[PDB]
């Protein structure tokens, strides 16, 4: 069951593509703060984990479409990663 590793790879891809496309969509909109790659990657993590502090968010339509993709693919893949971790921890419970 190493497809948890496959889920982790998809999540990292979603995070990286989200960071690249968010900066691409948000630059050109006056007032936008999601405009440099390092903090855009931090924003992708915030969204994939659904934490959503609100220190960063998109204000353009395409940035918000990029966010929707990061929500759908990122929350799903992140859900597969934590599910795997939870099942593994339940396995150690059995060892007692």
């Amino acid at each position: 069951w190493r497809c948890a590793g496959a889920a982790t790879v998809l999540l990292v891809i979603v995070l990286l593509a989200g960071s690249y496309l968010a900066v691409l969509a948000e630059r050109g909109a006056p007032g936008a703060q999601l405009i440099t790659y390092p903090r855009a990657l931090w924003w992708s993590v915030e969204t994939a984990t659904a934490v959503g502090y609100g220190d960063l968010y998109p204000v353009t339509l395409w940035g918000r479409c990029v966010a929707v993709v990061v929500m759908v693919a990122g929350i799903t893949s992140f859900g597969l990663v934590t599910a795997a971790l939870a099942t593994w921890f339940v396995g150690q419970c059995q060892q007692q």
Epitope: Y20, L24, R27, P30, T36, Y37
Partner: antibody, heavy 118, light 108 residues
Framework: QVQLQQPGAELVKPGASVKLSCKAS????????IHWVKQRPGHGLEWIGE????????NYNEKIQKKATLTADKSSSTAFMQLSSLTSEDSAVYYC???????????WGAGTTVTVSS | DILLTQSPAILSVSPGERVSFSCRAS??????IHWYQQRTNGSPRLLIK???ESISGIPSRFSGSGSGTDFTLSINSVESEDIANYYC?????????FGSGTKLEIKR
């Protein structure tokens, strides 16, 4: 090595156009943005616009009259700024600069002195 | 659009003194401010990034400080080669903007 090479000067007739070039060297990344900055003699720096060569999209300073058009060519690693229908107000030094997508201008070209005159 | 105010516009100093350049933003921009030096007929050259981080190749006497709206660039013991124009620039919100610049003059 000089990382951004610009021609030294361009003479343009009033009403004519010119295409400035900026040839990049060194490390190039997909996160690279090329910026253009205008400096009239005795004045400060004025941001014109930006382009991401790895994708080709450009944005422009919305506070000044739109006079420039940015393009790039990944083959020659050269960014271009088309200045069209120039007047005396457009006579200035035009720098290009590289930003690694992290907000600051690590590297500047030497600048192209553009004179609009008959 | 972030307005960056550099006041005063000219700074007159004796050699070896400490000098401080002021940059103030029209709203809070965290630490996303960067400093450049431009000598006569030269290109801008990055001195400090992100308000206080040093750049490889810049003398140790250059430092920066501040966050929010008030930022300052400092030269420990000014020297003749520091005679130039100094510009701040913000990257917190689109579009990037430059301050109007401060000239450094040395009283010798």
């Amino acid at each position: 090595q000089v990382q951004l090479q610009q021609p030294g000067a361009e003479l343009v007739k009033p009403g004519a156009s010119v295409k400035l070039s900026c040839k990049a060297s060194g490390y190039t990344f997909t996160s690279d943005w090329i910026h253009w900055v205008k400096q009239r003699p005795g004045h400060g720096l004025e941001w014109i616009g930006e382009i991401i060569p790895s994708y080709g999209r450009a944005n422009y300073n919305e506070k000044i009259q739109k006079k420039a058009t940015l393009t790039a060519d990944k083959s020659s690693s050269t960014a271009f700024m088309q200045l069209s229908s120039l007047t005396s107000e457009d006579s200035a030094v035009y720098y290009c600069a590289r930003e690694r997508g992290d907000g600051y201008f690590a590297v500047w070209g030497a600048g192209t002195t553009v004179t609009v005159s008959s | 659009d972030i307005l960056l105010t550099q006041s005063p516009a000219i700074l007159s100093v004796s050699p070896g003194e400490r000098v401080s350049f002021s940059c103030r933003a029209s709203q809070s921009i965290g630490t996303d401010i960067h400093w450049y030096q431009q000598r006569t007929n030269g290109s801008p050259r990055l001195l400090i990034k992100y308000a206080s981080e040093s750049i490889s190749g810049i003398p140790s006497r250059f430092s920066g400080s501040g966050s929010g709206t008030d930022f300052t660039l400092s030269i420990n013991s000014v020297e003749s080669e520091d005679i130039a124009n100094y510009y701040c620039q913000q990257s917190n919100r689109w579009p990037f903007t430059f301050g109007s610049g401060t000239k450094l003059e040395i009283k010798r």
